[PDB]
Design a protein around this ligand. Structure first.
Ligand code: A1L52
Ligand code: A1L52
Ligand code: CL
Ligand code: CL
Ligand code: CL
Ligand code: CL
Lengths: 173, 173, 173, 173
């Protein structure tokens, strides 16, 4: 490359792997969103929440791909694995699956940051810190807040609580 | 002092003591507010309510300190004791603790008013009447209204009631 | 915690310690500000400077507490020690005390950054770099600029210089 | 009187006496203001400060006279004694004379409040608290702040300090 400088093959490959993880996450959120749009589930605020996350994760992949090119690396795409489930259960089940997904992306970000630090690649480290690490922390905090409210609402009237959460916390429309 | 007039040492000291009580109250409300922002509590309206009170109590201390100087007294600061609890329980537990705190501040205001009356210090008495006594009465009334609504919502579904109170009465986002 | 990830007990505790240091600093600045509002000191620009810093340091504590919760740590509050002095001397004495205070906060920030680096906690490191380290450097530079101007103005006419500094450099109004 | 109620002859007379004191104070401030407008004194900000106070004290008398009539008492005017001096010295001398004057008015307000309290006349007490006591405290605090700044500026260059105070603290432009 005529521009590549201080950009290791290891980081280049890990970036491509992370693009795959973000596109898989986007796909998972597309599946979650449309599940909640089913006539027999019908929780608009939950659908909207997950569809928004599908877009956010795509944007994350886009930013990684832009940076790969800015650095002189080469984007390499792999097959995208389908989401882990076809049906996602209750809002609680779905929000738990989402927090599990987000922690896995966060760990991948942290692992890439550590590789960048080890390789003395401060542009990579700053890129992740400036556009991914705090965004992930903020999202996981939101999802934990949601889990706690969903859990408080289960009690002995689960359907009532699931409706009220979707109507009074989640944005709808 | 070149300006001090009709301002007793007893009032000056009690004013400094009251500044301590208001800053302690502000600190208590800072702790309450952040407790409700925990991911495992997650009641935004309750957090906002108490954080607002932390500011209001600081403002109270500020006004007392401004008046101390207007009168020619000397501000004296003491250590500020940490709040009485690290974890604040339910919204009900917290609102009960807040009403207890406010009654204690109110009693301190009333005690200072009585000292001012005894010392024939009408500026002090007017100051408390104009900026503190009715503010306290209004706040205690609001908190009692809240307690009654929180208590009516406990029934056999406590989590549901705690969510609904935070969503439909407390300001959030 | 359902959200805690890559957040050490050591960082959590140091964050709580730093909240204490920032609230102590806020309290010190509240005392400095009201000292300069005394009728026998009467330097409005100096009062305003320090009162503004009391708010800035509170805001710093607030940001730390928000982050503690975003990360899944638990805020723990301790007693707040009263400021080191009841009377703060001249503007020069006060500005020297403030630079000493700020260097101590800066060192605490640097120590926490180093702990975060050692623990491979890049979110913490970025948080401090983005919201605290440059703010501290900018403030210490301002205070040094002030010290130099205050010192140049002492000469053989200290009262004249103290008045002129407050009137022509410090904001009043 | 067809309207007089709970309004003692003692309060009525003391109100008339206080009108005299306020008009005497207004006259003193008129003399101070024009002294500072002399071509051989020439301190516009000091002149403006005292002329403003002449108006403020007249307004005070006007308010007392309005209240006397609201209560059913009868305004009675006495001779107004000329100010204590024809020439007022330095800005420092003048500001000291003004603080002495204001403390004397404040004491008269406090004495009237105490009479009203003794006579169970809460309208009178509220009137003084709402329109006079805090206004007096605020003005005496301002004058003390001014005295301190004037005194700090004397040093070994009195004319320089007197000019700088008038230019940088007092309103002119
Ligand atoms: C002295 C230590 N303590 C008591 C815990 C302070 C000090 C300063 C504070 N300043 C603010 C403040 C300042 C500007 C704008 C809003 C606020 C606010 O909402 C709450 C505050 O709370 C404070 C507590
Ligand atoms: C009764 C004799 N005395 C005392 C010396 C008065 C009478 C009337 C006065 N009327 C004004 C006045 C009227 C309108 C607008 C502004 C002003 C003012 O700035 C000061 C005054 O001062 C007064 C003193
Ligand atoms: Cl698969
Ligand atoms: Cl304690
Ligand atoms: Cl101490
Ligand atoms: Cl005479």
């Amino acid at each position: 490359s005529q521009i590549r400088q201080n950009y290791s093959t290891e980081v280049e490959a890990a970036v491509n792997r992370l693009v795959n993880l973000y596109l898989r996450a986007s796909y998972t959120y597309l599946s979650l969103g449309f599940y909640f749009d089913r006539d027999d589930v019908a929780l608009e605020g939950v659908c909207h929440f997950f569809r928004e996350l599908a877009f956010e994760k795509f944007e994350g992949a886009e930013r990684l791909l832009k940076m790969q090119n800015q650095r002189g690396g080469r984007a390499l795409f792999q097959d995208l694995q389908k989401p882990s489930q076809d049906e996602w259960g209750t809002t609680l089940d779905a929000m738990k699956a989402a927090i599990v997904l987000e922690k896995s992306l966060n760990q991948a970000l942290l692992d890439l940051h550590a590789l960048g630090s080890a390789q003395a690649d401060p542009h990579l480290c700053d890129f992740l810190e400036s556009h991914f690490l705090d965004e992930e922390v903020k999202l996981i905090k939101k999802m934990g807040d949601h889990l706690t409210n969903i859990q408080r609402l289960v009690g002995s009237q689960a359907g009532l609580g699931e409706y009220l959460f979707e109507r009074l916390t989640l944005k709808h429309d």
